Ligand binder design. Sequence first.
Ligand SMILES: *C(=O)/C=C/c1ccc(O)cc1
Length: 125
Amino acid sequence: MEHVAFGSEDIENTLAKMDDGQLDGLAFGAIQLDGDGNILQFNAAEGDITGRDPKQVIGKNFFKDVAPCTDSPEFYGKFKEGVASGNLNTMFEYTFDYQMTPTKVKVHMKKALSGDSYWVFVKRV
Ligand SMILES: *C(=O)/C=C/c1ccc(O)cc1
């Protein structure tokens, strides 16, 4: 395992050193998005939570394509506000229910240290 906790204060610094293989070592789901919501990275823990195969969703748009249940003010709305403002750090619970058994998670969205990409971190609750 990679030794970093969900919701860590400096998580964007710690994850700046991870290629796909190291992200796969996290204890929680990690998705990196560009400012439009396109998936840049998607780790193994996330695939275990939601069933998606990482290489099949990278390059897709998370809000339009992969996760329409997140296309709402309560999720995408927060994301887009953060992309627009150029800062994002929000944690909230949510239920993922598209083509899957509804699964309650805790989500932490945080702007990456890199200028315009955004993490979506997920763990079960
Ligand atoms: C709602 O449509 C949620 C979908 C979803 C969330 C997270 C994933 O890893 C994959 C799909």
